[PDB]
């Protein structure tokens, strides 16, 4: 029911994937480094309470009548619901507070990729908070109260709600399906694979940026799906796009979802074949994304897709080579990348006296 | 994760326990062929039987001819029914078509202008609606998406609204949920067990003057934006004064327990509960069944937040209209704005496997 907040690493990366997401990018409006550090400390105090299912500050009620309550109250009576709060720092943060020479080289700007149609207003950001929980109101409450605590020092640049599986009704070892109807997550780095996490996800001291040791790098892409076009494709076209069948999710020519793929049996521009580590010099990613459905656009089409999140030890050797290799992906006909951001996710909060960003700000 | 029975004298999704998630879609009709529209209603009813039982529509999501699109888009495969209910309604504009003019119920009244309205016409109205409620958002989206696909060329989605969490209750024996202002919302509603009150206030009766509507209800939908910046800087006393209940327990002012009966004379004259209470409106009583929403940011550095208000009633003229008229002096008006609106006639239930949505009208 709760996930420990403290550790060598931030929670919400290798910890079990929760049913819901509220992801928010913030822009910083203060130039005062001391005021920003103060905020990080207050945010960390609030996060400790939130992830344990307690209200922030003095609480949501019972205080002075003439004062606004410290907590806005909409999570009263709810459980912690495995809430994790994961903070990250965008490249643009390092132009402030004299941090320019502390930007990690692994926090690389992404190139323009073919077919990008990025909405500037739903891209970038000085920092992010990823709120994952099994109850979406727990996640929203966390973001709403962090933004309220930060008011005057940060503003919300963009936000995205997402959903995965509903654990109360769906088994844990069942692979969830994305909104194209295919199982999504079969060949991924699991949180149990400590060695693969050290190799592919966690920043190491020898990587060149000491304050990031134990952190990770996050790529976020809001990927719209062209639902109505996809739904008019034949079953064979859909399966040819991925290289797996739709019902079982087995690789072509195999029987079971978890059978290892035979890449030469897939079409040359099939998604799995292009994204597989063997096709990318061994590049391997921790995918931790969520489906979204925001409504319908002005043409009646479903505004839906995948809020893709990938964690890696170095953006240059993780997301960039794989996404570059998708230049000819058969899936490109049915998707469009419309938002993007990258973040350096710092190491964990070690104990009750530590605070978000302490290794960077000291 | 269980199924809610689809057949009955009334449609499910009204008196039914309120499910965690909402996907509401309003459709406009694009065909002038009454026969083709009746055929759609029958095909939609057949799909709804499958969907509410947790089965795929038509011949299924895979295993068909490779060269044909699958009958079901597949993203709900392996999921439980999740208490999915599908509730159809007919908007007043529908009755300008198919020779239905003289069948428009008088109880399906157009709403007057209310002070403070700022209604977006694009996200208002609609020839018909489908309310999809379920505990699993993927199940709800799947249902809307597949109904829309089946209806291609005969209906188009006009607007849609997702609700990430309920703000209503038809089960007073379960915990009352909170809206994004942090107050319990749903304490004094109509419970699904209160058969006499549902007959008096919710279900249309033959004697009311429209026989085809016997057993149905009337639905008002209002999209309400919340000014959370303004609210969140108000004092606790101000917030509690606005409603007439305390924030922590949700008891009427002066009393100890949520479900103690309000003593209205102890509330401020402009308190929401005092103004909305049946005793202040000649006995007018509503079944409220709304959900919270957030659609990103407002572009001004803040989270967007609202309440998608849904009310069912026996006659719009004796339910929503008098109550909302009495809210002209509501203290809550300082913190909300109605920005979308629609009314629908919700026909009687689908009696058995031979029946179909709208059969008593057509
Ligand atoms: C809407 C967009 C996308 C959809 C629907 C999608 C869907 C899928 C599916 C169905 C699979 C096979 C099952 C699995 O192993 O998870 C898969 C695998 C994979 N995808 Fe995607 N994907 C999308 C975007 C991306 C992007 C943007 C990247 C990276 C830049 C990516 C990288 C991968 C990787 C690495 C695998 C595993 C390949 C393997 O090792 O077998 N995907 N994806
Ligand atoms: C964002 C908008 C609104 C919010 C935050 C809100 C909030 C509340 C709250 C906190 C209660 C007290 C607990 C309860 O009995 O449910 C309440 C009661 C009630 N509300 Fe609202 N409400 C809103 C809009 C409306 C509207 C538009 C109507 C009808 C036109 C309405 C009608 C009622 C009724 C009939 C009651 C029960 C009064 C009683 O019999 O005691 N509300 N509302």
Residue numbers in the entry:
A (entry chain B): 56 to 417
B (entry chain A): 55 to 416
How is this structure described in the published paper?
Herein, we have chosen to use an extracellular dye-type heme peroxidase found in Streptomyces lividans and referred to as DtpAa. The overall structure reveals a ferredoxin-like fold typical of dye decolourizing peroxidases with two DtpAa monomers in the crystallographic asymmetric unit. Heme enzymes catalyse many essential reactions in biology and understanding their structures throughout their reaction cycles is of high interest, prompting extensive efforts made to obtain ‘intact’ structures at high resolution. A major challenge is to obtain the higher valence states of these proteins, for example peroxidases (FeIII resting state and FeIV intermediate states), as these states are phenomenally sensitive to reduction in synchrotron experiments caused by the presence of large numbers of solvated electrons or other radiolytically produced species, generated by the interaction of X-rays with the crystal.
To produce an ‘anchor’ structure of DtpAa, i.e. resting state ferric, free of any effects of the X-ray beam on the structure, we used the SACLA XFEL beamline BL2 EH3 to perform SFX with an X-ray energy of 10 keV, a pulse length of 10 fs with a 1.25 × 1.34 µm beam and a pulse energy of 289 µJ pulse−1. The chip was translated between apertures in the 33 ms separating the 30 Hz XFEL pulses, with a single image recorded at each position. The SFX structure was determined to a resolution of 1.88 Å from a total of 72 615 indexed and merged diffraction patterns [Fig. 2(a), Table S1]. The refined model exhibited a mean-determined B factor of 34.7 Å2. The heme Fe is six-coordinate with residue His326 acting as the proximal ligand with an Fe—N bond length of 2.19 Å (we note here that monomer B appears to be inactive and is consequently not discussed further). The distal heme coordination site is occupied by a well defined, full occupancy water molecule (W1), bound to the Fe at a distance of 2.40 Å. A number of further, well defined water molecules occupy the remainder of the heme distal pocket [Fig. 2(a)]. W1 is hydrogen bonded to a second water, W2, at a distance of 2.68 Å and also interacts with the charged side chains of Asp239 (2.92 Å) and Arg342 (2.74 Å). Interestingly, the side chains of these two amino acids are only 3.13 Å apart (Arg Nη1 to Asp Oδ2) suggesting a charge-based interaction. A linear fit to the data yields an intercept (i.e. extrapolated to zero dose) of 2.37 Å, which is very close to the value in the SFX structure (2.40 Å) at comparable resolution and within the experimental error for this bond length in the room-temperature structures.
